[PDB]
């Protein structure tokens, strides 16, 4: 197989969610955090032609950036990874699939409670401001007919009452109310625009970030609330 720069860039972003990954044959990749709070998926333009588990994905991608463009990724004789061209060959260990946490199945996300979106520049601002203000927790809620994202420091604010950053996503035309709480450590989406699908039912909840090249599903915190009584 040949992995283009776009695919390796996606795999590098997936490496921030999980140190390893399970690659299945086809044009689809997916991963999940070890604690299962974060999920990512993407259709790639390259064709994976064999199944292989990689324990240190970030180290594997570092090697790929150093080989020639015409290098071929194949399965070696002893059952590991072979990255070779007509002049040089690099070997990389293939991991036991039991040592890499992988999703049992993709998350289709067929329903939603509220649909909104976030621009690339606004997502970039949220990520950079959260580091300067020590924001570890965001809440997607409705305020004055607007869907907004509020940032908090939950370590110093357990009830999430002191807003340190607020981002207005757009108008909200509804009497439905909700406070969808997301851990900033799970906001691992790559730069770009994202459609935001919010879903909650009882004590379960999840948020889907639909991007131009990949999708991200993030679990909501237990303190999330919602009211769909219309």
């Amino acid at each position: 197989m040949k992995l283009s720069k776009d695919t390796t860039a996606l795999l590098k972003n997936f490496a921030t969610i999980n140190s390893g990954i399970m690659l299945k044959s086809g044009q689809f990749i997916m991963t999940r955090a070890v604690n299962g709070t974060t999920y990512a998926e993407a259709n790639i333009s390259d064709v994976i032609d064999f199944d292989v588990a990689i324990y240190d994905l970030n180290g594997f991608l570092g090697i790929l950036s150093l080989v020639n463009d015409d290098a071929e990724i194949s399965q070696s004789e002893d059952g590991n990874i072979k990255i070779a061209d007509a002049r040089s060959t690099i070997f990389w260990p293939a991991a036991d699939p039991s040592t890499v946490v992988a999703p049992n199945k993709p998350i289709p996300f067929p329903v939603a409670s509220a649909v909104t979106e976030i621009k690339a520049e606004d997502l970039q601002q949220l990520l950079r401001v959260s580091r300067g203000l020590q924001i570890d927790t965001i809440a997607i809620t409705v305020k004055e007919g607007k869907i907004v994202i509020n940032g908090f420091n939950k370590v110093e604010d357990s009830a999430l009452t002191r807003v340190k950053y607020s981002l207005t996503l757009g108008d909200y035309d509804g009497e439905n109310t909700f406070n969808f709480i997301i851990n900033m450590a799970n906001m691992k989406m790559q730069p770009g625009n994202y459609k935001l699908l919010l879903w909650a039912k009882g004590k379960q909840g999840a948020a889907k970030f639909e991007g131009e090249h990949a999708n991200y599903v993030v679990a909501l915190e237990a303190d999330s609330t919602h009211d769909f009584l219309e």
């Binding site: 999940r32 955090a33 299962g36």
Partner: peptide
Amino acid sequence: EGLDFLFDA
């Protein structure tokens, strides 16, 4: 358990 209610659907 995170998104396990969607992984095991």
